[PDB]
Design a protein around this ligand. Sequence first.
Ligand code: HEM
Ligand SMILES: CCCCCCCCCCCCCC(=O)O
Length: 406
Amino acid sequence: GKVIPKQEGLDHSVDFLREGYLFVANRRKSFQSNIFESRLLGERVICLGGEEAAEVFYDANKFTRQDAAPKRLLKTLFGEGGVQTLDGSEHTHRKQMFMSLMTKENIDRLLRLTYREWNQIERMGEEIVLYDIAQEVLMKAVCEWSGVPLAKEEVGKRTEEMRLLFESPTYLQGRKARSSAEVWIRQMVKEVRSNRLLPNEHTALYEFSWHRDESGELLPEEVVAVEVLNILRPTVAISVYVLFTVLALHQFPDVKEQVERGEVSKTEFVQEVRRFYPFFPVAAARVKTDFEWDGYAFPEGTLTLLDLYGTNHDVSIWTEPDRFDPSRFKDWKESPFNFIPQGGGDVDFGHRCAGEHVTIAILAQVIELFTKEYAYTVPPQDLSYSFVDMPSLPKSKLRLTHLTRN
Ligand code: HEM
Ligand SMILES: CCCCCCCCCCCCCC(=O)O
């Protein structure tokens, strides 16, 4: 029989913009609570953080993603009708559609495509901006991987579009991008179902354009365009983690040397990059019907936020969360709720991120290239990144000089 700590005032949206990734964490410390209530986007909002609130937030008996995501993110970042917006058996079936791609062999294909693209950054020369090059590498690799025709002369435009999507006046700049992208891919989709274009099996455009939902029926063309965009867009967004991974290599020379000696694996270095650096701030959902957790009352329909970054730095879960220390993962298996940079819960039956294996494999290959394959200088520059602006980026965008093969 407890009261949920409540912030006074009519609107805290401005405060959420002011404090970004530190909003939930500042209030969890301030209140000394894993739960509190704010007002934003016109509504009462319940905020949560930590292992046990995470396990509750991913309890499908208690929470629903139906109408959870705000319509403006549907407009710019997520797409309408996507797997994000789905329920029960329908969601399980479509989520199995995404997971069919994440086989080891199909990811191997992707990683061969990224290696081949990366191999050409020796082309550009003695001075690269890593964020730009990463985006273009990833865009060409993931377009190829998904059977998506991407001509050379249009690589700037399409990669730019995906960037405005995952970085979403600028609001409707991102809106315009989403529209352009969606008709591009919708176009290609109808050329697939009418045999004017023939993408390979085990690619997203092929397997999605042909997908039969649980009725036995193909999906609408715009929905297919959305589901493809939910692979193209976040793969390019991996560029942010590329920046943070090379930054980690430069910022923590001792762990870099432990990576090169094999004391810590590449996977573990990647995990600690995803835990240490901010990227996705909160997941969202809605109380299904009135329930109680921990003596607290959740009213039906209440929008609810789970703190991903904050949970990843939770001092009750992690020893010295503020130290970059990949050895914290060796040998340590995470639960599905204590380490959640790309969502919590079970991937196949919950809304956890589809692309985690892809993310980790691409970042591990980056560690290999930027320690063993290439040599380079990091000149003095602004390598700081924001805790309040979303998403966070090292300011200089990682300017590398004197980049030569080892
Ligand atoms: C190749 C790269 C990626 C792919 C293909 C991908 C794909 C997806 C998909 C399909 C979903 C919806 C899952 C569902 O509704 O069941 C999702 C959600 C999500 N993704 Fe990823 N993503 C990628 C990269 C990333 C990156 C770089 C981040 C950075 C933090 C991230 C974090 C998340 C989070 C937090 C969610 C929501 C979890 C939730 O709603 O419970 N993903 N992703
Ligand atoms: C309620 C979610 C607010 C997110 C606002 C900041 C955007 C950072 C997330 C970008 C991650 C890219 C992955 C994706 O494209 O789906």
